[PDB]
Amino acid sequence: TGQKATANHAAELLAKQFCTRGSPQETTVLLVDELDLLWTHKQDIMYNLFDWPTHKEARLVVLAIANTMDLPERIMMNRVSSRLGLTRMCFQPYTYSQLQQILRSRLKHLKAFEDDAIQLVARKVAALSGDARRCLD
DNA sequence: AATGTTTATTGGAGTGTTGTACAAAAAAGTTTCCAGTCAT
């Protein structure tokens, strides 16, 4: 909407709005990044966020973006990992044959680099950690 | 228009889990002060 309050005046209106009986909503999407910064001592930030789309008239699609996969079983405790699910599909880094193809798409009509230098740069980054940002730099 | 709430804010105001000694009661080790012998 457009109303701005605070962490308590607003946090109380969002709790009573998701449980409103007799009001249609839309299939929204929630995209959050870096979950370790939202961790508090009472664990009342990640636990209540996952219980919102588990209601009747709730169309929230949470896209929890983080780093490693063992976070729910390390930093977060039992209540956060319970009401979540085991639907954690990790993404593996690019292979050696994939780094030479992504760089080829960017240089489709750029006649300025030999074929012996393209595979050499994509070889050192593939052995370090396979980061997609450490190859084009 | 003449007030008075909010609105974070903030430096206190404690807070509890830390870590580095701490002071023994033992653990060692350290020869021990005669013992034996032997003679005369």
UniProtKB/Swiss-Prot annotation:
Disease: Meier-Gorlin syndrome 1: A syndrome characterized by bilateral microtia, aplasia/hypoplasia of the patellae, and severe intrauterine and postnatal growth retardation with short stature and poor weight gain. Additional clinical findings include anomalies of cranial sutures, microcephaly, apparently low-set and simple ears, microstomia, full lips, highly arched or cleft palate, micrognathia, genitourinary tract anomalies, and various skeletal anomalies.
Family indicated by similarity: Belongs to the ORC1 family.
Protein name per its UniProtKB record: Origin recognition complex subunit 1
Organism: Homo sapiens
Domain comment in the entry: The BAH domain mediates binding to dimethylated histone H4 'Lys-20' (H4K20me2), which is enriched at replication origins.
Quaternary structure, from the entry: Component of ORC, a complex composed of at least 6 subunits: ORC1, ORC2, ORC3, ORC4, ORC5 and ORC6. ORC is regulated in a cell-cycle dependent manner. It is sequentially assembled at the exit from anaphase of mitosis and disassembled as cells enter S phase. Interacts with CDC6 and KAT7/HBO1. Interacts with LRWD1 predominantly during the G1 phase and with less affinity during mitosis, when phosphorylated.
Main function: Component of the origin recognition complex (ORC) that binds origins of replication. DNA-binding is ATP-dependent. The DNA sequences that define origins of replication have not been identified yet. ORC is required to assemble the pre-replication complex necessary to initiate DNA replication.
Binding-site list for ATP: E34, N67, R133
Bilayer-crossing regions: none
PTMs per UniProt: Phosphorylated during mitosis.
Positions contributing to Mg(2+) binding: D33, E34
UniProt-annotated location(s): Nucleus
